[PDB]
């Protein structure tokens, strides 16, 4: 039933079946929220711990692409590993060639150029047999100031002022539309992100249920520690 | 192209590889191969499924193949796949000897062939080899050994095992009758004869329907020899005499 069609067949509506199925697969992931302000970018992801014997510190849904770029992922994290490695290698290659830092848009474009590079026929061994099942939120600070980007397995990437990905991306985006404004500060962005995460998460928000990282002008990628998270969740 | 593909290396909804199970059914339809490990040696006892009055005499053995100076194997399943696998086994043994100037340990050879089998069961789109193998040999690390390999690529060491037709009954008989640590080659041969007699119930046991090979150490050398017709006839005669004595004493 799943081999009736190739990986590169269009639907009668003009959509590739596999890309739509990967978009569906995204909605099973944990919710991630990115907010871009004039003071920086903040990323918040639900860890979604399954068992208390599990160590939440081993879950890495926020990663450091470079000193000025961070990535939040939702969907199939094992699929996001290779994309994150490609992003890191691209940033290092750009530094080697040009002695400068990549812009967030160029990194997102380089990662998105890998999305549709799948297919059975006319493919080298080791090529991708299917699209990726992850949505990436790229947040960073470059010469154009802090910027937030969203990428999906369709290969499309756009700039976002504030976006949510994952299972609760519909309710969170509606909440993001109300709370967000252009004059928002970084502290306000973090507080609103944590409030929306608490609203959408099944379990009670705490210092181990979530990840939170920030990138600011003049400061590297910074992942919040447990004491900082405890301080932020003190009053919400 | 996609329409004609059989997808031989895909999982089933229950986590099963159908081609491997079908190859194992093919194994179950093959002839009985028996292996017993003793203190002073290890033997193979295969059933001759190639029987006909117009068939010519076999060169060395129909189902028992020498792999190197210290190892021999017996095959159950598709014959030509068995030929391919035995050629590959000999190649692996010679490659190890070339690299290290020492005879290969038995488990390493079994592991190499099982790796080839697993590679066929995982990728390539080809059907798996429908052969199960019994391995006997001697090496400086573990002495006399007996191994069994599956078309899936799974192997394991044994003291006594059987593959092919009526293998479950033979396994039960060996479980009942094999004595760990007390077996001699003579008692092992008697047990092999009785197990072949009981399992091959449709055809009465004769020296022309079974092939027996033993592996012994003789003054620092490994001796792999196939029992002659008179020797197997004497073994069958002793088994029948013991059976008649038991019948009288009951």
């Amino acid at each position: 039933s799943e081999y009736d069609r190739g990986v590169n067949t269009f639907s009668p509506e003009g959509r590739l079946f596999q890309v739509e199925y990967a978009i569906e697969a995204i909605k099973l992931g944990s919710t991630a929220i990115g907010i871009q302000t004039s003071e920086g970018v903040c990323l918040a992801v639900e860890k979604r711990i399954t068992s208390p014997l599990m160590e939440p510190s081993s879950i890495e849904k926020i990663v450091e692409i470079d000193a000025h770029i961070g990535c939040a992922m939702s969907g199939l994290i094992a699929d996001a590993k290779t994309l994150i490695d490609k992003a890191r290698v691209e940033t290092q290659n750009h530094w080697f060639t040009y002695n400068e830092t990549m812009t967030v848009e160029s990194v997102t474009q380089a990662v998105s150029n890998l999305a549709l590079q799948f297919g059975e026929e006319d493919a080298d061994p080791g090529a991708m047999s299917r699209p990726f099942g992850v949505a990436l939120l790229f947040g960073g600070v470059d010469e154009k100031g802090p910027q937030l980007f969203h990428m999906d397995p369709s290969g499309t990437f756009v700039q976002c002022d504030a976006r949510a990905i994952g299972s609760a991306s519909e309710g969170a985006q509606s909440s993001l539309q109300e709370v967000y404004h252009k004059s928002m500060t970084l502290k306000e962005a973090i507080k609103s992100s944590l409030i929306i995460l608490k609203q959408v998460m099944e379990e009670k928000l705490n210092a181990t249920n979530i990840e939170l990282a920030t990138v600011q002008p003049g400061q590297n990628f910074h992942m919040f520690t447990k004491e900082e998270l405890e301080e932020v969740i003190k009053d919400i | 192209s996609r329409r004609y593909d059989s997808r031989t290396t895909i999982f089933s909804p229950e986590g099963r590889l159908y081609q491997v199970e079908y190859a194992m059914e093919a194994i179950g339809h093959a002839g009985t191969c028996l292996g017993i490990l003793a203190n002073d040696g290890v033997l193979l006892a295969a059933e001759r499924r190639n029987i006909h009055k117009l068939l010519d005499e076999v060169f060395f053995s129909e189902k028992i193949y020498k792999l190197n100076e210290d190892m021999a194997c017996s095959v159950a399943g598709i014959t030509s796949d068995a030929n391919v696998l035995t050629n590959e086994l000999r190649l692996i043994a010679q490659r190890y000897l070339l690299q290290y100037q020492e005879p290969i340990p038995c488990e390493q050879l079994v592991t190499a062939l099982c790796d080839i089998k697993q590679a066929y069961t995982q990728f390539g789109g080809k059907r798996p080899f429908g052969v199960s193998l019994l391995y006997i040999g001697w090496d400086k690390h573990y002495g006399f050994q007996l191994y069994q390999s599956d078309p899936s690529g799974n192997y394991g060491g044994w003291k006594a095992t059987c593959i092919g037709n009526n293998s479950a009954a033979a396994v039960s008989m060996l479980k009942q009758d094999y004595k760990e640590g007390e077996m001699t080659l003579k008692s092992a041969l008697a047990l092999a004869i009785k197990v072949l007699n009981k399992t091959m119930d449709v055809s009465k046991l004769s020296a022309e329907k079974v092939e027996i090979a033993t592996l012994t150490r003789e003054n620092g050398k490994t001796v792999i020899r196939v029992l002659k017709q008179k020797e197997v006839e004497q073994l069958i005669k002793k088994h029948e005499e013991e059976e008649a004595k038991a019948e009288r004493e009951k």
């Binding site: 450091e64 692409i65 490695d85 890191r88 290092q92 080697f96 | -």
Partner: protein, 201 residues
Amino acid sequence: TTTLAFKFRHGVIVAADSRATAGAYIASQTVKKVIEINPYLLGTMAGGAADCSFWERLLARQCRIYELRNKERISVAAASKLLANMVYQYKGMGLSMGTMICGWDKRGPGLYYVDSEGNRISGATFSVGSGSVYAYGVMDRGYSYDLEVEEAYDLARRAIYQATYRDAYSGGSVSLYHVREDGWIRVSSDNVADLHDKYSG
């Protein structure tokens, strides 16, 4: 070219000259022969300037990738091994590099000498370049593991100064670096004429 590095109780002292020559012609007197690979790793230039710069920049890229992947800084031994394996693939093709990889890691101060021929040796004191013999003599006469920081600075400066005095391909200014547990610092950059005034005078 004269580059030297030695380990003592307060880290690794790295010193170098700054003269680049093309035949008998001085192309530049302001060459940065100490390569700041990372905030924790240093390298030296001796031989081909382009070769050393390119391959140590590749090493810097590799170390940054390693830190990103493993979430931990690479060690001095691992970085030197990476550079040696990188340069061994082009052995016999004409690359001329002699470099010292200096840093501080979990094992303490580290100092490895890596050349394009394939050598990779850990040691206490090293000297590379055409003027390395004079620097070796002076440093060995004045070296001790129990040196004070200012004494180590003076020893490195004096050794490089003597090497530039005796070597025709060494000159310019002496660049001094100190590798400490929390990264390296650029100590100074003193012109050879000022050192001549200080020492002879």
